[PDB]
Design a protein around this motif. Structure first.
Motif, PDB file in Angstrom:
ATOM      1  N   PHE A 277      20.883  10.346  37.697  1.00  0.00           N
ATOM      2  CA  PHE A 277      19.722   9.965  38.582  1.00  0.00           C
ATOM      3  C   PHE A 277      18.375  11.222  38.435  1.00  0.00           C
ATOM      4  CE2 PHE A 277      22.331   6.694  40.278  1.00  0.00           C
ATOM      5  CZ  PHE A 277      22.004   5.528  39.767  1.00  0.00           C
ATOM      6  N   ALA A 278      18.648  11.820  37.502  1.00  0.00           N
ATOM      7  CA  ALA A 278      17.455  13.160  37.649  1.00  0.00           C
ATOM      8  C   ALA A 278      16.021  12.461  37.761  1.00  0.00           C
ATOM      9  CB  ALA A 278      17.664  13.927  36.310  1.00  0.00           C
ATOM     10  N   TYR A 279      15.627  11.644  36.682  1.00  0.00           N
ATOM     11  CA  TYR A 279      14.352  11.195  36.700  1.00  0.00           C
ATOM     12  C   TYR A 279      13.955  10.370  38.067  1.00  0.00           C
ATOM     13  CZ  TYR A 279       9.998   8.955  35.380  1.00  0.00           C
ATOM     14  OH  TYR A 279       8.728   8.769  35.268  1.00  0.00           O
ATOM     15  N   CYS A 280      15.062   9.813  38.465  1.00  0.00           N
ATOM     16  CA  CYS A 280      14.723   9.273  39.828  1.00  0.00           C
ATOM     17  C   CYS A 280      14.412  10.313  41.132  1.00  0.00           C
ATOM     18  CB  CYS A 280      15.753   8.297  40.274  1.00  0.00           C
ATOM     19  SG  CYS A 280      15.702   7.413  41.735  1.00  0.00           S
ATOM     20  N   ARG A 281      15.138  11.203  40.898  1.00  0.00           N
ATOM     21  CA  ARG A 281      14.972  12.449  41.836  1.00  0.00           C
ATOM     22  C   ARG A 281      13.797  13.129  41.663  1.00  0.00           C
ATOM     23  NH1 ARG A 281      20.398  12.747  41.187  1.00  0.00           N
ATOM     24  NH2 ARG A 281      19.993  14.383  39.639  1.00  0.00           N
ATOM     25  N   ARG A 282      13.153  13.200  40.445  1.00  0.00           N
ATOM     26  CA  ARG A 282      11.939  13.889  40.297  1.00  0.00           C
ATOM     27  C   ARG A 282      10.699  13.136  40.977  1.00  0.00           C
ATOM     28  NH1 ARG A 282       9.197  17.268  36.133  1.00  0.00           N
ATOM     29  NH2 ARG A 282       6.884  16.245  36.037  1.00  0.00           N
ATOM     30  N   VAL A 283      10.909  11.725  40.363  1.00  0.00           N
ATOM     31  CA  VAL A 283       9.656  10.910  40.984  1.00  0.00           C
ATOM     32  C   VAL A 283       9.811  10.667  42.385  1.00  0.00           C
ATOM     33  CG1 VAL A 283       8.752   8.527  40.607  1.00  0.00           C
ATOM     34  CG2 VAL A 283       9.787   9.569  38.704  1.00  0.00           C
ATOM     35  N   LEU A 284      10.914  10.622  43.079  1.00  0.00           N
ATOM     36  CA  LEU A 284      11.069  10.415  44.334  1.00  0.00           C
ATOM     37  C   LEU A 284      10.317  11.872  45.226  1.00  0.00           C
ATOM     38  CD1 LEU A 284      14.493   8.917  44.945  1.00  0.00           C
ATOM     39  CD2 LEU A 284      12.259   7.972  45.744  1.00  0.00           C
ATOM     40  N   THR A 285      10.800  13.037  44.650  1.00  0.00           N
ATOM     41  CA  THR A 285      10.454  14.112  45.268  1.00  0.00           C
ATOM     42  C   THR A 285       8.863  14.594  45.108  1.00  0.00           C
ATOM     43  OG1 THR A 285      12.480  15.349  44.605  1.00  0.00           O
ATOM     44  CG2 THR A 285      10.561  16.694  45.081  1.00  0.00           C
ATOM     45  N   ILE A 286       8.311  14.033  43.896  1.00  0.00           N
ATOM     46  CA  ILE A 286       6.680  14.077  44.042  1.00  0.00           C
ATOM     47  C   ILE A 286       5.937  13.098  44.777  1.00  0.00           C
ATOM     48  CG2 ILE A 286       4.883  14.066  42.260  1.00  0.00           C
ATOM     49  CD1 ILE A 286       6.765  15.430  40.169  1.00  0.00           C
ATOM     50  N   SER A 287       6.694  11.863  44.634  1.00  0.00           N
ATOM     51  CA  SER A 287       6.084  10.828  45.639  1.00  0.00           C
ATOM     52  C   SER A 287       6.137  11.341  47.086  1.00  0.00           C
ATOM     53  CB  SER A 287       6.864   9.774  45.484  1.00  0.00           C
ATOM     54  OG  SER A 287       6.655   9.155  44.210  1.00  0.00           O
ATOM     55  N   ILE A 288       7.117  11.854  47.586  1.00  0.00           N
ATOM     56  CA  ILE A 288       7.223  12.490  48.967  1.00  0.00           C
ATOM     57  C   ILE A 288       6.421  13.580  49.041  1.00  0.00           C
ATOM     58  CG2 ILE A 288       9.022  13.521  50.676  1.00  0.00           C
ATOM     59  CD1 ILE A 288      11.139  11.484  49.170  1.00  0.00           C
ATOM     60  N   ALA A 289       6.260  14.303  48.450  1.00  0.00           N
ATOM     61  CA  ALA A 289       5.219  15.689  48.485  1.00  0.00           C
ATOM     62  C   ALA A 289       3.829  15.036  48.775  1.00  0.00           C
ATOM     63  CB  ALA A 289       5.290  16.405  47.403  1.00  0.00           C
ATOM     64  N   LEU A 290       3.689  14.210  47.846  1.00  0.00           N
ATOM     65  CA  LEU A 290       1.962  13.510  47.870  1.00  0.00           C
ATOM     66  C   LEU A 290       2.135  12.739  49.249  1.00  0.00           C
ATOM     67  CD1 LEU A 290       1.612  12.557  44.268  1.00  0.00           C
ATOM     68  CD2 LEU A 290       0.289  14.419  45.464  1.00  0.00           C
ATOM     69  N   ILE A 291       3.120  11.874  49.447  1.00  0.00           N
ATOM     70  CA  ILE A 291       3.052  11.216  50.832  1.00  0.00           C
ATOM     71  C   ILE A 291       2.797  12.120  51.933  1.00  0.00           C
ATOM     72  CG2 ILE A 291       4.442   9.866  52.392  1.00  0.00           C
ATOM     73  CD1 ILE A 291       5.475   8.566  49.902  1.00  0.00           C
ATOM     74  N   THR A 292       3.346  13.189  51.981  1.00  0.00           N
ATOM     75  CA  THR A 292       3.252  14.197  52.943  1.00  0.00           C
ATOM     76  C   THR A 292       1.846  14.552  53.194  1.00  0.00           C
ATOM     77  OG1 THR A 292       5.543  15.043  52.684  1.00  0.00           O
ATOM     78  CG2 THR A 292       4.068  16.340  53.762  1.00  0.00           C
ATOM     79  N   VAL A 293       1.188  14.946  52.247  1.00  0.00           N
ATOM     80  CA  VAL A 293      -0.468  15.405  52.240  1.00  0.00           C
ATOM     81  C   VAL A 293      -1.211  14.105  52.473  1.00  0.00           C
ATOM     82  CG1 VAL A 293      -1.979  16.342  50.899  1.00  0.00           C
ATOM     83  CG2 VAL A 293       0.348  17.034  50.251  1.00  0.00           C
ATOM     84  N   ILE A 294      -1.067  12.896  51.991  1.00  0.00           N
ATOM     85  CA  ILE A 294      -1.728  11.876  52.157  1.00  0.00           C
ATOM     86  C   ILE A 294      -1.710  11.448  53.910  1.00  0.00           C
ATOM     87  CG2 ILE A 294      -2.104   9.426  51.679  1.00  0.00           C
ATOM     88  CD1 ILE A 294      -1.327  10.038  48.824  1.00  0.00           C
ATOM     89  N   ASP A 295      -0.507  11.468  54.378  1.00  0.00           N
ATOM     90  CA  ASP A 295      -0.233  10.990  55.703  1.00  0.00           C
ATOM     91  C   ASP A 295      -0.923  12.347  56.591  1.00  0.00           C
ATOM     92  OD1 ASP A 295       1.467   9.486  57.646  1.00  0.00           O
ATOM     93  OD2 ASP A 295       2.012  11.500  57.839  1.00  0.00           O
ATOM     94  N   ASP A 296      -0.737  13.527  56.224  1.00  0.00           N
ATOM     95  CA  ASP A 296      -1.564  14.642  56.972  1.00  0.00           C
ATOM     96  C   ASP A 296      -3.018  14.258  56.978  1.00  0.00           C
ATOM     97  OD1 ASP A 296       0.665  15.800  57.848  1.00  0.00           O
ATOM     98  OD2 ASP A 296       0.181  17.634  56.584  1.00  0.00           O
ATOM     99  N   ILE A 297      -3.644  13.488  55.875  1.00  0.00           N
ATOM    100  CA  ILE A 297      -5.091  13.244  55.922  1.00  0.00           C
ATOM    101  C   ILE A 297      -5.222  11.998  56.716  1.00  0.00           C
ATOM    102  CG2 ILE A 297      -6.751  12.262  54.282  1.00  0.00           C
ATOM    103  CD1 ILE A 297      -5.747  14.192  51.930  1.00  0.00           C
TER     104      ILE A 297
END
Ligand SMILES: CC(C)=CCC/C(C)=C(/F)COP(=O)(O)OP(=O)(O)O
Ligand SMILES: [Mn+2]
Ligand SMILES: [Mn+2]
Ligand SMILES: [Mn+2]
Length: 514
Positions: free
Chosen positions: A258-278
């Motif tokens: 699930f390497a590709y899954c972990r990559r897309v999840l990690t970047i999604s979550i990092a972006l969610i974190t920023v968007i949520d702060d906004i």
């Protein structure tokens, strides 16, 4: 924020090497034949239990499947139920975990209709406590079992290993933890055993260290991608939460494939974190409404025309990331999921907007109305969509459409997630009392104190897990058991991170010796 890009690039684990992977194949074979010599049912059950807690079970799935199906065949035999509470609870847990029917009535012999459960053996009470988390809605023996065992385990803490086991089961039962998270603790428990299988233990240590090395390589690659987008340079609040995001993604899907899954999840979550702060710190309502609309239109030209400056890069980073995600699945397997993934992102963003309108109106919804929206805003529906689309080949159209219909398992799993996250709010943050989460909504609506509201919310989660247990056992839903695990593992990760949210450093970066 110490585990920065330079640190991640500098790592060079010895366990990426081909010699270790060779010794692992050697041990896997020697373990498979030693499993052949385990013929007594309780020994087989304890074997599965050990394989699972060591992190090794996905290497022996056929062997576990065989043991369990044979025990299911045999367990209606005449004198099967030996009336050992430990053994009966272990068997109930393992069979329910893997989807085999077992009645709550297997426990009725340990229970007096007037005085309740009768047991003084800690080992049996601990195993019964673990088994009670597999209960379904309306199973009053299992509910009574949980009342009896949690009371007993709490009084146990008012022998040094016995106290630790009771403490650990009270704060996180096995059903609520993803497999790798506990592996290092249990690996040490296992080697401190007289009857330990030495090859199994050595295989557990080796596989743990190889997994770390695999994740460190992925982190080097994800780290570079985060650096390239440069959000951490534009937005002083866009702190590097990459390792923290990867931790969630590894809890969701730990296996090498699930390497590709972990990559897309990690970047999604990092972006969610920023968007949520906004949405709940930095953006004005008018800015939040433009960003919501730009997501809904999914039009880069419109977004660059109308968004505030500090939002343009954050939007374009999301946009290009998701469009490349869609591209990758199109190339890999000729499936077009763009409408699905951008719809999932829109739902999250809309749920964020609802909460920001509530906050500016100083409106305090009832818990039920708060949770209706809050199960979306906690990202549950988005994350299982991402996990399914990045972790499944081939994507099944019927299976994706079921997820998009907002099924019950996603509804109740995301509610738990939301409750569990809101319990991470601290007491001093309840008093200033600006934006209202689960605890404040429940206090306002019932008059309970904060301390009682926390306890009631913790009970709500345990009751909601009972519904999830029913949807997980439903062999007629379009969701495979593989897909459902992504969802449960998301919830489990929220339970784990409430306790520990340095264990991430311990999970990812420090091997087990020898
Ligand atoms: C990381 C992940 C898998 C999903 C995002 C939700 C989550 C657990 C957070 F910690 C995000 O921050 P926060 O707790 O602030 O979320 P909010 O309560 O503002 O909605
Ligand atoms: Mn928020
Ligand atoms: Mn937030
Ligand atoms: Mn929160």
């Amino acid at each position: 924020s110490i585990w920065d890009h330079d640190f991640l690039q500098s790592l060079n684990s010895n366990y990426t090497d081909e010699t270790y992977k060779r010794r692992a194949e050697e041990l896997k074979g020697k373990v498979k034949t030693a499993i052949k010599d385990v013929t007594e049912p309780l020994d087989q059950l304890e074997l599965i239990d050990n394989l699972q807690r060591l992190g090794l079970a996905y290497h022996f799935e056929p062997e576990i499947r065989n043991i369990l199906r044979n025990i299911h065949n045999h367990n209606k035999d005449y004198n099967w139920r030996k009336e050992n509470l430990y053994a009966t609870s272990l068997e109930f847990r393992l069979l329910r975990q893997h989807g085999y029917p077992v009645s709550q009535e297997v426990f009725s012999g340990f229970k007096d209709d007037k005085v309740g459960f009768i047991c003084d053996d800690f080992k049996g009470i601990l195993s019964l406590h673990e088994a009670s988390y597999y209960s379904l809605e309306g199973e009053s023996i299992m509910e009574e079992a949980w009342q009896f065992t949690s009371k007993h385990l709490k009084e146990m803490m008012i022998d040094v290993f016995v106290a630790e086991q009771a403490k650990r089961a009270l704060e996180l039962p096995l059903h609520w933890k993803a497999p790798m998270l506990e592996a290092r603790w249990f690996i040490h428990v296992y080697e401190k055993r007289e009857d330990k299988n030495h090859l199994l233990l050595e295989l557990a240590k080796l596989e743990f260290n190889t997994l770390q090395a695999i994740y460190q390589e992925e982190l080097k690659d994800i780290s570079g991608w985060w650096k390239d987008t440069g959000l951490g340079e534009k937005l002083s609040f866009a702190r590097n939460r990459l390792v923290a995001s990867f931790l969630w993604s590894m809890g969701i899907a730990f296996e090498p494939q699930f390497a590709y899954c972990r990559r897309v999840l990690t970047i999604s979550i990092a972006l969610i974190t920023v968007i949520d702060d906004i949405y709940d710190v930095y953006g004005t309502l008018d800015e939040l409404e433009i960003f919501t609309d730009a997501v809904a239109r999914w039009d880069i030209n419109y977004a660059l025309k109308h968004l505030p400056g500090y939002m343009k890069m954050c939007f374009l980073a999301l946009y290009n990331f998701v469009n490349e995600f869609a591209y990758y699945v199109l190339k890999q397997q000729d499936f077009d999921m763009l409408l699905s993934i951008k719809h999932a992102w829109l739902g999250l963003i809309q749920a964020y907007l609802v909460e920001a309108k509530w906050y500016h109106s100083k409106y305090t919804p009832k818990l039920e109305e708060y949770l209706e929206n809050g199960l979306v805003s906690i990202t549950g529906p988005l994350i299982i969509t991402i996990s399914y689309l990045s972790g499944t080949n081939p994507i099944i159209k019927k299976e994706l459409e079921f997820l998009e219909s907002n099924p019950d398992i996603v509804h109740w799993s995301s509610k738990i997630f939301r409750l569990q996250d809101d319990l991470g709010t601290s007491s001093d943050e309840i008093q200033r009392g600006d934006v209202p989460k689960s605890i404040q909504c429940y206090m306002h609506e019932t008059g309970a104190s904060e301390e009682v509201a926390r306890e009631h919310i913790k009970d709500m989660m345990r009751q909601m897990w009972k519904k999830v247990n029913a949807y997980t056992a439903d062999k007629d839903s379009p969701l495979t058991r593989t897909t459902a695990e992504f969802l449960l593992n998301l919830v489990r990760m929220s339970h784990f991170m409430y306790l520990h949210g340095d264990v991430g450093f311990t999970l990812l970066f420090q091997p087990i010796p020898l």
